[PDB]
């Protein structure tokens, strides 16, 4: 009856907060005589050291679900990749509190991965919904030659093909480049006037600097950039009038930890009440057998519903990603981020604040412009 729940948070403070949340869930709602146990380990600097420490300190402790977060350190990785891969040899589910990378969305790579935050795919979905509600039919899609950029491009193309719509062209971008002026000139030599860009912070800063000298910040150049492009040097070099996106409660790790603990407890209760549970391996060395109840626990977690969380309705997609998240449509006004609209899911409700556009124009621009230079 004794259960243990592992976790990997950012050192002592978040570990203590996770333990407090575990105790609260033990003393609230479903409260049995022997509910579960709380274990945690800090993110080690070396990925190999982190992987071996997770192995030794969690599999030997009979963990059923392990919570892992991704601290956004720019210089270092500190990614959940080693922990996810170590848990992938078995079928122990993991929860990503703030894993914003789109790599984990594919289950071919990460066999058993879950998270409570839509990495970038639902961000592209919000882009599509905003372009639909604002009547945008001319999109210049700038996509980096990386896995997350390709995934975002594929999702946007699939969403556009739903209504039999297709962008004029999708410019490719290589990370770390500095000669993107040719790509920007190609974008300028197009009928479309709105640009959707998805890149890292340094790439966003570089393309902003390149486009500043090409008169790409004038009237009619609508920008629908994402979250990574309105922070750091990207925010510093971001042209005025950017309609950026910011995820509500996506940075507050404590709320995600509490939601993950609640969902894990509910899934454990459902699994125990459903059928028998196979005991987790005593150690992570010696036994190569795959967990038989691993896929069942994954299905229970994915189908689990948590309406008492801080984000209201909490549910998982077929890829183990948060569905119907709260996105805030941010706007840049006088080099300051001004929140305008909130994305509650399949609905966009702008507030009374007026959305400004690049070039200082007050009226809403349009992507429909006739070149009148038909070659």
């Amino acid at each position: 009856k004794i259960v243990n729940i592992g976790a990997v948070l950012s050192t002592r403070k978040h570990e203590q907060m996770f333990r407090e949340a575990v105790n609260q869930a033990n003393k609230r709602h479903g409260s049995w005589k022997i509910q579960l146990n709380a274990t945690s380990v800090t993110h080690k600097p070396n990925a190999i050291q982190m992987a071996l420490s997770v192995c030794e300190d969690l599999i030997s402790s009979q963990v059923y679900a392990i919570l892992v977060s991704h601290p956004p350190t720019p210089n270092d990785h500190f990614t959940p990749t080693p922990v996810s891969y170590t848990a992938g040899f078995y079928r122990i589910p993991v929860l990503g509190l703030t894993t914003r990378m789109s790599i984990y969305s594919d289950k071919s790579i990460h066999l058993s991965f879950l998270r409570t935050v839509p990495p970038y795919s639902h961000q592209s979905s919000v882009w599509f919904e905003m372009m639909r509600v604002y009547s945008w039919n001319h999109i210049i899609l700038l996509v980096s030659d990386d896995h997350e950029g390709r995934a975002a491009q594929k999702r946007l193309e699939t969403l556009l093909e739903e209504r039999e719509s297709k962008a004029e062209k999708v410019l490719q971008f290589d990370p770390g480049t500095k000669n993107v002026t040719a790509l920007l000139m190609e974008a300028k030599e197009l009928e479309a006037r709105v640009i959707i860009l998805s890149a890292s912070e340094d790439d966003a800063a570089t393309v902003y600097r390149a486009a500043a000298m090409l008169n790409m910040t004038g009237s009619g150049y609508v920008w629908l950039v994402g979250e990574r492009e309105i922070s750091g040097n990207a925010l510093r070099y971001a042209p005025d009038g950017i309609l950026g996106l910011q995820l509500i409660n996506g940075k507050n790790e404590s709320a995600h930890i509490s939601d993950a603990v609640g969902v894990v407890a509910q899934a454990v209760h459902e699994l125990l009440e459903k059928e028998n549970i196979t005991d987790p391996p005593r150690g992570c060395v010696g036994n190569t057998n795959i967990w038989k109840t691993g896929p069942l626990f994954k299905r229970v977690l994915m189908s689990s519903k948590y309406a008492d969380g801080v984000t209201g309705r909490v549910e998982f997609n077929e890829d183990g990603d948060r569905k119907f998240a709260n996105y805030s449509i941010m706007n840049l006004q006088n080099r300051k981020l001004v929140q305008v609209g909130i994305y509650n899911g399949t609905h966009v409700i702008p507030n009374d604040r007026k959305i400004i556009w690049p070039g200082g124009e007050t009226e809403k621009p349009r992507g429909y412009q006739m070149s009148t230079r038909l070659k």
Partner: antibody, heavy 124, light 108 residues
């Protein structure tokens, strides 16, 4: 300009009360977390209090727990710290600084920017 | 609590030389550490975040390194405006504590 100004310091007899006002300029106070840190002369720096954006999560240092009170006025963009039961060891230079848990992840502070600071002296 | 020890307490170096400051924590704090520069009579200013990331508006000569229990701050070229007191502060767990501090002096 993003600058902070400390005001309200002075000489207070032991056992009295004093209030410190931190002025926020160049940015909105409701968008960042604030914290008070004092620097005893001839000693290191010691973080004292922490106030969250929502105004409901308040944490005090164990050394001065139960004696200090921290309040914020988002509309006024000013920070107010209340000190009680001042002692000789409380004589330190108090600085109010801006945290970074909003833009960055939780727990990331690296307090910046720092105001010019004020000197609080306790002597009978 | 977390105890940070800085050795040496004081050091002297000439202009243009490389200065190494060692910060050692009692426990393991991964990479959660920050560096401040404090002038006499002036409030400290942040230099390095996450023990390796250079802050905006700070000269590139400042660069940190190390992780876990030992940390190192390195200045590529010492300058007259770099002579101050440096504190390594960790934000691993509450309460947030600052190191004793290291002051850069002039070797004559």
């Amino acid at each position: 300009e993003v600058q902070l100004v400390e005001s309200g310091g002075g000489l207070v007899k032991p056992g009295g009360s004093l209030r410190l006002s931190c002025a926020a300029s160049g940015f909105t106070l409701s968008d960042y977390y604030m914290s008070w840190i004092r620097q005893a002369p001839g000693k290191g720096l010691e973080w004292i209090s922490y106030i969250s954006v929502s105004g409901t999560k308040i944490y005090y240092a164990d050394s001065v727990k139960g004696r200090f009170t921290i309040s914020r006025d988002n509309a006024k963009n000013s920070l107010f710290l209340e000190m009680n039961s001042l002692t000789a060891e409380d004589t330190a230079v108090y600085y109010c600084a801006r945290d970074s848990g909003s833009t960055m992840y939780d727990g990331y502070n690296w307090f910046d920017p720092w105001g010019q600071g004020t000197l609080v002296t306790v002597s009978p | 609590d977390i105890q940070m020890t800085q050795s040496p307490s004081t050091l002297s170096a000439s202009v243009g030389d490389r200065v190494t400051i060692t910060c050692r924590a009692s426990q393991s704090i991964s990479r959660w550490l920050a560096w401040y520069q404090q002038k006499p009579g002036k409030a400290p200013k942040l230099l390095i975040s996450l023990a390796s990331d250079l802050q905006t508006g700070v000269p590139s000569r400042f660069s940190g390194s190390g992780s876990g229990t030992e940390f190192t701050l390195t200045i590529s070229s010492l300058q007259p405006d770099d002579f101050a007191t440096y504190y390594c502060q960790q934000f691993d767990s509450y309460p947030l504590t600052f190191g004793p501090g290291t002051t850069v002096d002039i070797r004559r």
